[PDB]
Amino acid sequence: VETFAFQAEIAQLMSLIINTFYSNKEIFLRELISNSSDALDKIRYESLTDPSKLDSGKELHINLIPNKQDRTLTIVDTGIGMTKADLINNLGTIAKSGTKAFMEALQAGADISMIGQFGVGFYSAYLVAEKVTVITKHNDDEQYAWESSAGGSFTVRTDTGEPMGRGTKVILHLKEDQTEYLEERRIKEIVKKHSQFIGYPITLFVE
Numbered sequence: 556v557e558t559f560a561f562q563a564e565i566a567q568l569m570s571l572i573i574n575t576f577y578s579n580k581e582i583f584l585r586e587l588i589s590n591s592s593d594a595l596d597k598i599r600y601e602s603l604t605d606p607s608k609l610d611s612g613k614e615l616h617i618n619l620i621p622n623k624q625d626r627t628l629t630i631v632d633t634g635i636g637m638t639k640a641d642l643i644n645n646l647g648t649i650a651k652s653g654t655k656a657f658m659e660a661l662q663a664g665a666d667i668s669m670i671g672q673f674g675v676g677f678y679s680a681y682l683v684a685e686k687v688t689v690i691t692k693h694n695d696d697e698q699y700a701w702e703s704s705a706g707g708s709f710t711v712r713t714d715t716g717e718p719m720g721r722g723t724k725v726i727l728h729l730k731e732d733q734t735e736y737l738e739e740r741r742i743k744e745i746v747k748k749h750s751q752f753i754g755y756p757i758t759l760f761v762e
């Protein structure tokens with residue numbers, strides 16, 4: 556297991572997300588679904604010229620998996636996936652510059668819900684989760700698990716769990732007071748409100 560420090564700007568972004576009073580927490584799901592859609596777009600485009608990139612799985616979809624027993628909400632996609640290098644480099648995001656652009660878009664009146672416009676929507680996960688695990692598999696690398704409970708550090712390790720084929724799984728270990736996001740009707744409501752026109756099948760698993 557390797558432990559890394561977040562860049563100062565990202566730790567600041569996470570501290571802001573965790574500590575700022577902001578009731579509209581449901582946007583985290585929109586942001587994660589958007590990321591999955593972006594990753595799915597990428598493997599789709601690459602497969603147009605090289606269909607063998609789909610040997611790791613032809614289906615392009617997003618699954619939402621609540622587990623009330625574990626208090627986890629998991630978002631799984633079969634997009635392009637991330638390499639180990641991507642994970643360490645802020646999960647394939649432009650997080651340093653994006654955080655800068657977000658930080659003082661906020662000072663120009665913006666609110667937290669615009670976070671995705673600055674490429675760092677992922678970190679909105681910390682509105683609802685005390686810990687986030689990101690398990691990912693890119694065609695060119697092995698399957699890795701990234702994890703952080705904030706506090707300035709993250710870990711990366713080779714994943715031992717179920718083979719994913721290709722794509723990304725974001726596991727949200729929910730805060731005690733945020734269990735509404737495990738309820739079927741709440742999830743459906745949020746998907747219909749914010750993600751109605753995502754161009755990939757979104758399947759909400761039941762328990």
Ligand SMILES: COc1ccc(-c2c(-c3cc(C(C)C)c(O)cc3O)noc2NC(=O)C2CC2)cc1
Nearest residue numbers: 590591593594597634635636637646647648677723
């Ligand atoms: C908005 O920033 C993003 C969005 C998606 C990704 C991404 C992902 C990916 C990343 C995340 C976050 C953990 C950041 C996610 O929730 C879902 C995903 O499928 N897998 O491969 C990728 N690699 C990519 O190059 C792609 C298409 C965007 C990385 C950065």
